[PDB]
Design an enzyme around this catalytic site. Structure first.
Site, mmCIF file in Angstrom:
data_model
loop_
_atom_site.group_PDB
_atom_site.id
_atom_site.type_symbol
_atom_site.label_atom_id
_atom_site.label_comp_id
_atom_site.label_asym_id
_atom_site.label_seq_id
_atom_site.Cartn_x
_atom_site.Cartn_y
_atom_site.Cartn_z
ATOM 1 N N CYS A 148 -18.309 -1.224 -16.311
ATOM 2 C CA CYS A 148 -18.476 -1.008 -14.883
ATOM 3 C C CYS A 148 -19.717 -1.664 -14.285
ATOM 4 O O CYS A 148 -20.822 -1.528 -14.811
ATOM 5 C CB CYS A 148 -18.511 0.495 -14.614
ATOM 6 S SG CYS A 148 -18.585 0.935 -12.853
ATOM 7 N N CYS B 247 -13.071 3.219 -13.807
ATOM 8 C CA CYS B 247 -13.540 4.569 -13.541
ATOM 9 C C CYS B 247 -12.347 5.517 -13.492
ATOM 10 O O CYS B 247 -11.991 6.063 -12.443
ATOM 11 C CB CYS B 247 -14.311 4.600 -12.227
ATOM 12 S SG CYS B 247 -15.291 6.116 -12.026
ATOM 13 N N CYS C 253 -25.318 4.328 -11.542
ATOM 14 C CA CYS C 253 -24.429 5.474 -11.394
ATOM 15 C C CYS C 253 -25.028 6.754 -11.983
ATOM 16 O O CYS C 253 -25.382 6.800 -13.158
ATOM 17 C CB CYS C 253 -23.093 5.164 -12.070
ATOM 18 S SG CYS C 253 -21.941 6.569 -12.128
ATOM 19 N N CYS D 258 -17.469 3.174 -18.575
ATOM 20 C CA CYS D 258 -18.744 2.830 -17.959
ATOM 21 C C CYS D 258 -19.399 1.526 -18.397
ATOM 22 O O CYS D 258 -20.040 0.858 -17.591
ATOM 23 C CB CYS D 258 -19.740 3.977 -18.154
ATOM 24 S SG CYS D 258 -19.214 5.556 -17.407
ATOM 25 N N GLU E 144 0.830 -1.198 0.000
ATOM 26 C CA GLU E 144 0.000 0.000 0.000
ATOM 27 C C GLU E 144 0.867 1.251 0.000
ATOM 28 O O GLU E 144 0.568 2.216 -0.701
ATOM 29 C CB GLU E 144 -0.935 0.014 1.215
ATOM 30 C CG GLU E 144 -2.023 -1.049 1.163
ATOM 31 C CD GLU E 144 -3.018 -0.828 0.033
ATOM 32 O OE1 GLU E 144 -3.799 -1.757 -0.262
ATOM 33 O OE2 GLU E 144 -3.028 0.273 -0.554
#
Ligand SMILES: Nc1ncnc2[nH]cnc12
Ligand code: SF4
Length: 220
Positions: A198, A189, A204, A196, A37
């Site tokens: 997605c 995204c 959305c 999209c 991370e």
């Protein structure tokens, strides 16, 4: 979109396209997730892979990283940029060795107390490595959630609090898959011309109004 439907759709999507084969996604431990991370905070995945492998080979455990000279850590970090991350990485490793006997903490407060680790990163470390029930909110996630039509600049406290939506859609059951899915979704995204492909396209608001450019808001 209803929260329950949001998490369900993202998880179903992850199960079919959720490519979780990266080094830090196999035989996960808090140490490995934390390390990845931090490296991924400001560096692309392709660039990070070789460094992650090199670091895990040289520092199999957090104590090995803690005991190593800082100069060696910085030398191995060369090429990743944003060295403040490396300096904090080493301090955090030393804090774990000093306060937690070399066992990377598995409790939220102790993880968040580490240098270089905030609320989102702590949530990511524990949710991904142990399945603990915490939501995340990095750049990728903010984009996806903002496109519930949150048009304010996340730099504003009230907008940030609004986005921290993340809690509402994040489940306890399957949290590790959901959090990884959200990051994959935001990363692959995109800022410009989102694809999209997605799982959230049917609900959305940004997709419905072809207004993704408005979310999140830019610094005024
Ligand atoms: N889990 C993750 N996968 C890919 N890119 C990331 N950037 C930050 N966290 C990431
Ligand atoms: S539908 Fe489009 S704008 Fe909405 S979350 Fe998915 S990629 Fe982003």
């Amino acid at each position: 979109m209803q929260a329950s439907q949001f998490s369900a759709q993202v998880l179903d999507w992850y199960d079919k396209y959720g490519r979780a084969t990266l080094p830090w996604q196999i035989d996960k431990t808090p140490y490995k997730v934390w390390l990845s991370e931090v490296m991924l905070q400001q560096t692309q995945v392709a660039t990070v892979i070789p460094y992650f492998e090199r670091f895990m080979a040289r520092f199999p455990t957090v104590t090995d990283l803690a005991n190593a000279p800082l100069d060696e850590v910085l030398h191995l970090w060369t090429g990743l940029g944003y060295y403040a991350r490396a300096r904090n990485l080493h301090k955090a490793a030393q804090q774990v060795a000093t306060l937690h006997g070399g066992k990377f903490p598995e409790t939220f407060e102790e993880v968040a107390a580490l240098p270089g680790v905030g609320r989102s990163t702590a949530g990511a470390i524990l949710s991904l490595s142990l399945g603990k029930h915490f939501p995340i909110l990095d750049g990728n996630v903010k984009r996806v959630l903002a496109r519930y039509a949150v048009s304010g600049w996340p730099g504003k406290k009230e907008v940030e609090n609004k986005l921290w939506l993340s809690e509402q859609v994040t489940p306890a059951v399957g949290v590790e898959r959901f959090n990884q899915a959200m990051m994959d979704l935001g990363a692959m995204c995109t800022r410009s011309k989102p694809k999209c492909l997605c799982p959230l396209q049917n609900g959305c608001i940004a997709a419905a109004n072809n207004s993704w450019a408005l979310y999140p808001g830019k610094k005024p």
